[PDB]
Symmetry: D2
Subunit: 348 residues, 4 copies
């Protein structure tokens, strides 16, 4: 089924994880420029990541095309698109052509320049026939809207997610307003992605939801937060924290943190539930297992976890076996293991 | 160049990471049993991980045979062939000794595996993850009886094995049983691990015995662990996330290991490709080259020097990441827990 | 020199600490009721505390009359007479407004106390610990009707009073009701407190109104508190120990308060004599003198320069204590809690 | 009753708190030299502290004579002694003449010099007729023993407490041995004081106890630990921690931590239960209330606390009232309130 049909059919769409961060850790991406050349340099590495996400329950394979626009090549987009489709066809998933904020917009290159960059990328996805489009990682509504108006042209479903928190985009536009302007432009799915942990992200989504309601408008809700806890981030997101991007390890969410996220996202009415930087395959599976009752099945990766925490029953040690209760893991306040370190830092 | 060759020549041999923890995360292993059944069910998954480690700088592709005892050895062989790497057949403590069971039954389990590595001709062997010096000894005795060099590492800390046997004595009895390479693996973080290796190294020296040192610690900080290691921590094995070492923690470990005289420097549970790469980069001057994966990195954050924000560009340097006391991001959580 | 004199002359008036929390610790007050009944039961206890604050540098001996409404005023008078100090008659929010009860009943409670301070001739008055701008207003209205200068501080943070009234507006209505000195006291740590004072100061300025600023924050760090303050924290009031500010935290607060334009610098719950002394020492250059208690101290650890151990002597300096991120000593505990 | 009679009568002797630290905070003592001149300069300040401890349940008023020996005056000792007796006579307490380690011993001034300093102080206590003697704050057994042999001369009861942890004194003598040599010399009460928190302190006392048992010897057990948590201290004690002595605030024990300490001390067989640096009057009262059932009564300060945590019942706020349960406070993992700070530091 398609994306709007799935959603409308009352289904829960599970997104895929954070590619650049995941690939960076496996040795195929360079932190800093965070570019997707691995699609052509090392396709097997990209293909395997897609499969792990697919095996974890993702219903979407986003094209590894983050920062794959020009003035930042076209062979990459195409190669990425192929791998994504190549992998999607292996299960119940759709390919999603994605575009992000652009340098051209940042360097103040008026409004006719950027859309050309967007269209420049939209072209490959159309010739590749992707199932729908995502305008993600946008800190400015105006550029977000411009990207939407460009992608709707393809006549396909377009999702738009803002990299903003409860306080608004860089120009001061609250999330409620951002959601409206985004829907008034064509997006049938609106959400938030990156910059903040699941908790803060859902607060953002709640505000967008209420903004739409007060606008008598409607659209599917989507969320792809960081898998890193960020109680210390200011409105600028995790990038401003001292540990970005090489000391974020201690902040990584456990699978239990993500199941809680999925449950709250569902309760909020979010139906496209994914993740961004920090999300590894097991985090996506966490979304899948937690909402198994609401969906109707379990993903293939659950064959290596399945038993909710009860997998420890096959443990050779007694103490580990006592932790085979699901409420044990969901009530446990895990230790950081770094007593000589602080629990929060101040944004730069 | 075999394992003993490189070592004797005074070379630094980089090990691979922790396969079962890594694959569990990716969806191919089951936490609890921790079996390598994926070696036949999803070879490309096991193959890709091997390749990532190879690309990160590993000189050893340990056969995905922790526990159990099939096509794993082949995969390991195929990837080692793609670079400067050797295949290692490994055997871990048996659940047989777990349920006690004499010396006969144990060496039976081991022998079956050795014949396999015997048939696929591995470069050397690894008596791995042993909590009792005695069971580790029997393993070594069976392995040496194949001609291939044998490495033996204990899953014990400064207090010794689960029988009260000190690390120094433990090491002694390991070498006296034919071990050319000894050390530690798993159970404790890099810091506690090197304390243990130091003890072993001192017990060896006190006995006029010589042997190459090896270390494959957890990539998890465990200042709160007791003599039983991290499995006893309440967070094992599903809430260990916060404890994972940064690439900088690993570079510090690599230097220290090197300064201690360790030349078989690897990692265990928790170690992902970038961690191995950290070893290779930290010791790049010594070894004289950078691993392939370094083309996708920067020295101590160098890769960030072109980022848009000033304070992020400011992080493109050694002086920054090695002094940064990173935040846990969990103010409502404790920093340590009590074993059990 | 009266309270308004010193202030108008641009002098820095140092307040005293938190009597009820201090006495509770010493065994003279009851946590829960927090009544000043000790003023008649154990005068020397109340007297000694006043003296310690006076010796630490306080220029105001607030009458031990928080809640209730006797011999307290005398004690306060006697100690102020022993130094450069004034007596302050204080009245706090009534449990009457708590149980609602009109404007008549409340001003009745206040009036009884004002007559007392009226009869013992206090230097000035303090409308203290008010969570609602309205009830604080009535208090001020009754107090100004005595001729003595009136100071009014709210037990609210940046989000305003428990009715939704912003700090700026709250301050406005306080001055418009006769308050010559306004500010905040209790509920939040020094940092959140000065954020609140800044708001008040901005609401005052926006209204072309002028008045001396005052601050008496908790000596407890409360980064986790919500708009209701520390009473809502799970640790209130018996597990607050870890949150207590060091003398260095207080010196930082004192400087910041001063830079903000606050000239009535004091403290509330948690403030012990050495905390007050920290205010006096940090601002010693400005004020031009050190309090008597400074003969038993050293600037930024100077007093340790003769200690036997090297690393302790090393701590005899500013550059050390102001940069030191002190450990909690409780690794099995969280660093923040959730209100309720 | 006397000290050995009290103890022998199955009674629990409650010590007094940490004077120099308490006085330092109130403005009468100078951190660094930590000397007791306040006895003469400001007696009312000293007298009031003694009373607070007496009111909290202390059965002993130690003479504010720490670092009051010569080459570090005699009027101070006498003045202190008077205040202590002056206050003791106000209740069920004894006066205890105390002596600590000496500079003379540190500067290697042989064995005949030091005892003279000790005797030089013993003289005032005898002429003042103190109830018994305490040789406290000793990091070297040998000097501890020398002080004992000198104080027993007075024919009075002598208690000896070591400022050492589970690992032994500065010369490497384990606690077990230290306890023997201490009893073989005259002390009828042996213990530990200062340097470590209550938990580590009791571990030290357990080792001294077992040492005595293995020596077929016996003596009353005593403990006066710091009221500061020190899980990060090495065998040198809290002095080597970066925060000594001006940044120790966050480590201060709550009254609940101390009640747990008192209970465990009692269970270990300790009968002289006190405290050292960090202990304020409410900490001593905590010892008193916790062992009320084993003693038979409550101290006078309990009239301002009494109800075990149930004092919140008279609180004007609901939430506070819900914390009037004793098990609430004893299970609560209190927050440090400093998320930007570490939980442990490394000894210098
Ligand atoms: N769909 C993408 C989203 C990446 S968001 C990456 C933010 C990087 C910020 C920076 O420029 O440093 C992915 O899966 O990686
Ligand atoms: N070479 C092996 C070492 C595995 S050590 C795994 C310890 C598991 C403990 C448990 O059974 O829970 C690997 O790479 O995984
Ligand atoms: N000037 C007074 C201010 C007291 S503010 C006390 C707040 C108590 C809150 C409660 O009722 O628990 C003092 O010095 O104590
Ligand atoms: N009985 C005395 C014991 C004091 S122990 C003080 C240790 C100080 C260490 C130093 O010299 O800095 C008291 O009650 O203060
Ligand atoms: Zn992202
Ligand atoms: Zn392991
Ligand atoms: Zn207060
Ligand atoms: Zn002490």
């Amino acid at each position: 089924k398609g994306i709007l049909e799935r959603l409308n059919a009352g289904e829960i769409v599970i997104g895929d994880g954070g590619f650049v961060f995941a690939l960076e850790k496996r040795g195929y991406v360079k932190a800093g420029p965070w570019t997707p050349e691995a699609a052509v340099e090392h396709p097997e590495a990209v293909r395997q990541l897609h499969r792990e996400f697919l095996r974890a329950g993702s219903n979407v394979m986003q094209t590894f095309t983050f920062y794959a626009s020009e003035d930042k090549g076209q062979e990459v987009n195409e190669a990425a698109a192929d791998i994504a489709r190549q992998v999607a066809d292996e299960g119940d998933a759709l390919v999603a052509g994605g575009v992000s904020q652009t340098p051209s917009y940042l360097s103040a290159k008026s409004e006719t320049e950027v859309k050309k960059v967007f269209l420049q990328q939209l072209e490959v996805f159309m010739k590749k026939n992707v199932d729908f489009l995502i305008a993600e990682y946008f800190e400015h509504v105006e550029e977000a809207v411009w990207a939407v108006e460009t992608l709707i042209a393809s006549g396909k479903p377009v999702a738009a997610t803002m990299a903003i928190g409860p306080e608004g985009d860089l120009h001061g536009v609250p999330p409620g307003e951002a959601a409206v302007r985004l829907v008034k432009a064509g997006a049938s799915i609106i959400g938030v992605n990156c910059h903040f942990d699941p908790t803060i992200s859902l607060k953002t989504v709640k505000l967008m939801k209420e903004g739409l309601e007060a606008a008598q408008l409607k659209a599917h809700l989507m969320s792809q937060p960081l898998a890193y806890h960020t109680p210390d981030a200011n409105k600028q997101g995790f990038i401003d924290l001292p540990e970005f991007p090489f000391g974020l390890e201690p902040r990584v969410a456990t699978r239990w943190d993500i199941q809680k996220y999925a449950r709250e996202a569902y309760n909020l009415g979010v139906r496209y539930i994914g993740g961004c930087c920090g999300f590894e395959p097991y985090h996506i599976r966490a979304i899948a297992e937690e909402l198994a009752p609401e969906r109707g099945f379990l993903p293939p990766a659950s064959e290596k976890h399945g038993s909710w925490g009860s997998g420890l029953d096959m443990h050779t040690k007694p103490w580990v076996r006592a932790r085979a209760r699901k409420e044990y893991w969901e009530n446990l306040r895990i230790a950081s293991g770094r007593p000589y370190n602080p629990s929060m830092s101040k944004p730069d």
